Amino acid sequence: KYFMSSVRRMPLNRAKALCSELQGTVATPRNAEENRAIQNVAKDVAFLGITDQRTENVFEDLTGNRVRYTNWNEGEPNNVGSGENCVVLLTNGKWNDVPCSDSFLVVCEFS
Amino acid sequence: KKYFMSSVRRMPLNRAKALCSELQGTVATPRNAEENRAIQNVAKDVAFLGITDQRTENVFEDLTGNRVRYTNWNEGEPNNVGSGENCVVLLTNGKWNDVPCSDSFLVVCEFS
Ligand SMILES: CO[C@H]1O[C@H](CO)[C@@H](O)[C@H](O)[C@@H]1O
Ligand SMILES: [Ca+2]
Ligand SMILES: [Ca+2]
Ligand SMILES: [Ca+2]
Ligand SMILES: [Ca+2]
Ligand SMILES: [Cl-]
After folding, report:
1. Which DSSP symbol is given to A104?
2. What is the B73 CA–ligand 4 centroid distance (Å)?
3. How far, in Å, CA of B63 to CA of B78, rounded?
C-alpha cells in the first residue's frame, strides 16, 4: 500500500471522490504499522476509510468489511452532537469519530 | 521508486496538474523507456504527460521548466498543428503526440 495525503480539507464525500479519481480509496489502517505510516503522511487531522453509517457502533471500511484493528482515542467513539459516523486520525495517531459532513484532510491508499 | 496512477475522468492540462498536486504528486514525466512502459501499464486510454513546449516552441520541458532528455514521439510528431499544440499525451501504443493544452485526456500522476 502507498499512502498520499491531500493538502486541502474537504468532507467525506469529496474525500472519497478524490481517492477514487486516481483509482485508490480513503486509507484504512489494518494494523499499528499502517496506522503510523498514514499518520506520518498526514500533516493534520485526516479522514480514514471507516464509518458506522450502516449500523451505529459497527465500524467498517468503505467496502463493508468490518474493521478489526482500531486505535480509538480515550473516550472515543462517542457519537456526540447529532451523530458522528465518520472517522479521523488525530495528529497523535489515535482515532476520533466525527460528522461525515465536517471537513478534514484525506489520506488516500493505493496498491 | 516512482508510482504511477491514472485518473478515471478526462480533463485539460491545468486541471490535470491540480489533480496530481492535490495528493502532492505531479503529472507523470517518463525519464526513460522503462518509465514510459510503467505509465502505459496504468493508462487505459490516451493520457497527459507532464511535458510542454509552452516557453519556447519545439523546446520540451517538464512542468518545472526543466528541459527533458528522453522523448518517444509518434511518427510525424511533434507537429504543432493549427493554433498550436503545446502539451503532450501518451498514445495507447506508448508513443507520444503533442496536443492542445485545452483538450481533455486522462492524466497519469507520478509520486515517489
Ligand atoms: C488531425 O490532428 C490530430 O491528429 C494528428 C495526427 O494525424 C495529431 O498530430 C494531432 O495532434 C491531432 O491528434
Ligand atoms: Ca456513529
Ligand atoms: Ca467523537
Ligand atoms: Ca508546440
Ligand atoms: Ca500533434
Ligand atoms: Cl455523520
Report:
1. B
2. 13
3. 18
Closest chain A residue by Cα to residue B109: A22
Residue B49, C-alpha cell as written in the block? 504527460
Task: Enumerate chain B positions whose Cβ falls within 8 A of a Cβ in A.
Answer: 3, 5-9, 19, 21-25, 109, 111
- The SS3 assignment for A39 reads helix
Of B3, B7, B22, the CB nearest to A7: B22
Resolution (A): 1.7
Distance CA A87, CA B108 (A): 29
The DSSP secondary structure of B69-86, one letter per residue, reads ----BPTT-----TT---
Q: Rounded to whole angstroms, how far apart are CA atoms B17 and B63?
A: 9
Determined by which method? X-ray
Closest ligand 1 atom, residue B82 Cα: 2
CATH class (in words) of the domain with range A1-111: alpha beta
Residue A51's DSSP bridge partners are: A60, A86
Domain B1-112: assigned CATH number: 3.10.100.10
Q: Which helix (H) or strand (E) holds B20?
A: helix B13-22
Question: Is B58 within 8 Å of B20 (Cβ atoms)?
Answer: no
Cβ neighbours around A49 below 10 Å, total: 25
Closest to B112 in 3D by CA, of A3, A15, A19: A3
Residue B97, ligand 1, Cβ within 6 A: yes
Query: Where do the structural domains in chain A lie, given as residue ranges?
Result: 1-111
Q: Which three cell numbers stand for residue B40?
A: 502505459
> B22 - beta bridge partners?
none
